[PDB]
């Protein structure tokens, strides 16, 4: 019994709760995405000075 | 007799009724099923702004 106990007490120190990080994932792949596009925006700045001359 | 009696006694105050917990324990599957389902389709939220940039 004791040994049982010592074993759950460790997992309920040190586990993780999967279902948090799934959203989280899923959120920060889609803020990937839109830093990447976003990065991609700014990117093409100063591009138009070309067109001054 | 009375020890017979005192032992159902007992049991009478402190037994189950499992065919409730049969009951309780289907419907219960099918909730948590549902409600990874639910979790699952709630997470795909803000995925749709990529596609506005």
Same mark, same amino acid.
């Given at each position: 019994k004791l040994q049982?106990?010592?074993d759950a007490g460790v997992g309920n120190l040190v586990d993780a709760d999967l279902a948090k990080e799934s959203a989280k994932l899923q959120s920060? =792949?889609?803020?990937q995405q839109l830093g990447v596009q976003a990065l991609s925006i700014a990117? =093409?700045?100063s591009s138009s000075i070309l067109s001054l001359f």
């Open positions: 049982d106990s010592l920060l =792949q889609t803020k990117n =093409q700045s």
